[PDB]
Design a protein around this nucleic acid. Sequence first.
RNA 1: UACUGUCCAAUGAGCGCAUAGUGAGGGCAGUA
RNA 2: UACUGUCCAAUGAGCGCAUAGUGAGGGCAGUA
Lengths: 125, 128, 236, 237
Amino acid sequence: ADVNPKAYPLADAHLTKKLLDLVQQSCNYKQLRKGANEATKTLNRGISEFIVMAADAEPLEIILHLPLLCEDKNVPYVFVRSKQALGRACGVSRPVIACSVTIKEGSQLKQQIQSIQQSIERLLV
Amino acid sequence: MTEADVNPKAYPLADAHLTKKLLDLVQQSCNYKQLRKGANEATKTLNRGISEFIVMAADAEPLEIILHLPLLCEDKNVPYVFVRSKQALGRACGVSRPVIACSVTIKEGSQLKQQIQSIQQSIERLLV
Amino acid sequence: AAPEYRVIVDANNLTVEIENELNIIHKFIRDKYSKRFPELESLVPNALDYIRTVKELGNSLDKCKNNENLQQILTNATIMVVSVTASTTQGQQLSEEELERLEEACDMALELNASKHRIYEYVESRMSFIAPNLSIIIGASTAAKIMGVAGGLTNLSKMPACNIMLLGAQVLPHTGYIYHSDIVQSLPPDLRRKAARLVAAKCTLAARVDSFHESTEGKVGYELKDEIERKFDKWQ
Amino acid sequence: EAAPEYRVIVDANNLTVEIENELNIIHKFIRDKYSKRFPELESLVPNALDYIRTVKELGNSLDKCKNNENLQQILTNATIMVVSVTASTTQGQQLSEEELERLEEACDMALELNASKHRIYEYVESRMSFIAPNLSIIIGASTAAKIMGVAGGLTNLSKMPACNIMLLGAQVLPHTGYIYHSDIVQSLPPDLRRKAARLVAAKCTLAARVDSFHESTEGKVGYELKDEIERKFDKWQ
RNA sequence: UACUGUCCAAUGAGCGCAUAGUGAGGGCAGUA
RNA sequence: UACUGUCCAAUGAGCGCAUAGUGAGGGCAGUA
């Protein structure tokens, strides 16, 4: 089923998965901040790698600010079709409507991340 | 043999009969939350001027680790007495370990007021 | 410039200043009037109702039974009480200087008071256009407060709930405008911290909803407050 | 009472830290204004005094790194080979007499400060072991002179609860004070430090008190507590 | 949680960042 | 600690005072 128009950019059923096991991986690695609040904190502080949001979160607007902080420091962001999924992915019993992957010098995830960064760019204008 | 020979610096040293009354009082004041257990913790109650009396154990080796206290109850004019066993004392404060110093904190409208009263007088009596 | 909010925030401030004044006047009029009718202080406990009365009965205590104006302010109970207790007054009359001053002070209270209301009516009538969903949860007042110190509804929407909760704290540690709001205040004091967190949290949501002028007729806001109200009724 | 010896040592102790700072800074100045020729050497030997010492010799001519006598006695020979290979593969240019003159001059400075440093530590460690012998045995000459500096002398230092003593001269890291950054604590796995501090803190409070009255002058209590502590550190890994 | 065994413990167990901060499981009942 | 039942929980569980302060039990292993 089609998502709300504001959800953009929206990731292929492929990108979706690639993202969610990045997020899982970056979870057992200390480089994950989970929750729309904590998400914003890190955007503010300039230490976010990318943002993942959950286009099924109502009211949608409850996360739509994050996109506007990605403009201050240019930072990527994507919408996966479902938050229930993104919660399992972050290592939590409950839904998660956004998350943010910390910046940490010399992280073995360093490559697997930029891999995602550059993947989202290709989605945008 | 008489173990009646303890370090002289441990002054004044409670009469056996007295020594009971303290442990007993200390045991109760532990239950009325008017008790602090510890070298360090007693020092605090002295400075904050909220200790009625100080009880120390002559067992305390080296003894100097608590001799700083008598010099402080001089300043704040607080009664202080030594009992013979750090071990006996620990058990009174309800502690499986030895306790070499405890203080009976001040607190208003507590039934142990007159008890503490007496104890205090009785200590005064030997410091004089 | 021309920041609409800044005015609202600014106006809402009078109302607390006027609120402060009214308080002073009351304490004053209660103080002076107790020379003429001491016992009144405690029959009418309400600041405003107490003034309206000393303005009404004044030096003649007898004019308080049968009184049309009074009857529209005080229960029959309280009226019949002040009426009997005022034939046993226990205090002398007032000299013109003492009365004109006190009467003049009353008139003030009321002019302030009723002007304070015309100010509130503005602050709500606006606060619900700049940030409708917010206002419904906390209070048009408290809303405009935090929005004031956040410096805009936009900068407000770019904040973590954790922070918002803290907006306006210097009493109690880390109590801010939300902790002192009406909603957070109207419950048993232990339940007020869990309650501040909650409300801060849910406002950070409404704030965000309104930074996009969505749900303008006010939807989100009501549902949100409901969820909150039940979470309360649950706690006891 | 007038000029009390402790004060003189506290202030004396302080010049050492002043000089750590001064050297730390001279270090950075030389490795920097030298990383122009042999920029790599910096990364090769990471040790201040050694570095500074070497760069005074090496100097303007960098041929003959092998078989020099002080280059030898100042350096391990296993690490004197790894230079001549990156010495031939030189990465920088020769130096003006104005840029060298100020480098040599700032080395002599470095070393002469370093001398003065040690010979102050020698003084403090000595007199400290007469002033408060047991306290010293545990934490160390200097750190002991620090807790004393601020406590205002062994008497008060003594009347202080360990909790307070632990926090002496703290403001980097919250509620960590002289004893936390002491030597005997820092030499541990970082997870072990927040505990170790309170352990040391508390034993120091005992020594401190014992020294207050001038017992265990030979240093007995001190040595004992220092052992009871080291041993608990093993049981602890 | 109970019990058992061992170690440590008032001669101090455990705590200790950031408040425009923190950031995961938690409460109640019953059973073991 | 574990199990069950139920109520909450990233749309945020729990924290929020003192730091020249705090002040009691704790860790680990075996058993249920």
